[model samples]
Target: NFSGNWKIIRSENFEELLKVLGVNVMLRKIAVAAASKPAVEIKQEGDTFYIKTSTTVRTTEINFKVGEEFEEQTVDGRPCKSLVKWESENKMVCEQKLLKGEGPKTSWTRELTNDGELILTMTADDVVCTRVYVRE
Candidate 1:
């Protein structure tokens, strides 16, 4: 159901999640700053998804098919093996494990709300972050 442009409205504990992932303090601060509003756009074609994440500072695009393992580079430049799967029609889970072997693994669950918002739940270590987005 995440087939449109969405604009981030707010976030909770995103910095803590970054901290748990060992992101540098300076980069994490900038990532969570008030000026950093991210926009996500997703386009789906059958089993494949084309996703774009954009902020004033950076923009990244990734395309993947459901249940397929793919190589991905995090915004912080960490290489990871990533896969996406559907939990339900309205929910999708994307998991990323570090390719370097002992680093933290992260999972992102994208769910659609009854009110037409996209709720992104990110988990890293014991830290959980939530970002709310409204359709654009």
Candidate 2:
């Protein structure tokens, strides 16, 4: 289960996403390090979970249950809702329904890596950006 405290060991292409999101160079540099070692706390009781991802740059919290529908605003506060599905024994998938606006508003997916890593992929306007994180 992904029901434990996990720390980030590394990541890729996150800086590019930050740039695309209009984060400045200095902040981007710091964001790289901040994101490289995030602390994630995931607690699960039966089919429900409370996930909290924390880093120097930001902290986010989500309370969800498998197969339950919910709405979520991204870190950038985009208007979107998502559903989480259990894909495998230890893997989970999320499909986000995005709100129409400027720049690539649509769907995306996220999965948990085999080694307890977190992987995120955003797909919009026929473009995809991926980021990976390892457990610490």
Candidate 3:
């Protein structure tokens, strides 16, 4: 399932979402490479989850518990309260609320495809980015 490493190839419109979040050009560039050939790994133990994202220029880690609120930082270092929970057997949803106020709150859904693909639908500031990852 999603417990192993996956290589991602995302869709369009992510840079615009970065623009809406006031991400720096450097970070935006980092995200560009990350989107194109992202190395994303997901691990779960019990009801807790961890997502490790590694790219050529940057690496980010997210750890959260289902049905619980946790303080974490986004890829560009925006501190936020994150909540993640399973919506269904094959779907996980994450919601992030920025601490600094103003700008966009983010929500993302991770769905498992029947063909062993993971589809990530992320939205922030009304901009949506859909990424597809095949199991490796």
Candidate 4:
């Protein structure tokens, strides 16, 4: 489980990932500038997960589990076949198979830190972005 509610603290190498995913230039500008504040809540219901995220540009609510496929849209508006699982007890990983466009499958890793932080790592076509969240 997450330590508590988390707030966006910093994002590293996100713009490069965004560009690699083909986000528009203008939106990229806005995304970075508005990336200052983001909110997310995580809950564990047995082995399933409840993830609700809200940011300046995107809001997503998803409930997913390992081996179960769900329909989800990426922040870039691509449809996906989403599956969530754990890399370890404290680390969760989600893989999204692209249902449209030229991009390949992408994976996201969410890990809870001992220092009380949520670290989200995204990997798409070899591009990796890490966003850090401070526990609130």
Question: Considering every candidate listed, which one attains the maximal lDDT?
Answer: 1
**Residue 30, candidate 2: how far off, in angstroms?**
4.4
* Model 4 regions more than 4 Å off: none
**Could you give candidate 3's per-residue lDDT for residues 26-117 as a string of tens digits?**
87877776668878899978678888877776678888878999887653567888888889887888888888865577878888888889
Angstrom error of the Cα, residue 97, model 2: value is 2.4
Candidate 4, residues 92-131: lDDT per residue as tens digits? 7888887866575577888888887889998877888899
Provide the lDDT at 84 for model 2. Answer: 82
User: Over the stretch 102-122, how does candidate 1's per-residue lDDT look in tens digits?
Assistant: 666677887888888999888
Local accuracy by lDDT, each model: 0.81, 0.68, 0.79, 0.79
Cα shift from native, residue 116, model 2 (Å): 4.6
In each prediction, how many residue pairs overlap at the backbone (N, C-alpha, C within less than 3 A)?
A: 0, 0, 0, 0
Q: Candidate 4's error at 90, in angstroms?
A: 1.1
Q: Residue 106 of model 4: what lDDT?
A: 75
Candidate 1's displacement at residue 61, Å, is 0.8
Candidate 4 has its poorest 10 consecutive residues by lDDT at 98-107
**Range of the 10 consecutive residues with the lowest summed lDDT in candidate 1:** 31-40
Q: Could you arrange the candidates by TM-score from highest to lowest?
A: 1, 4, 3, 2
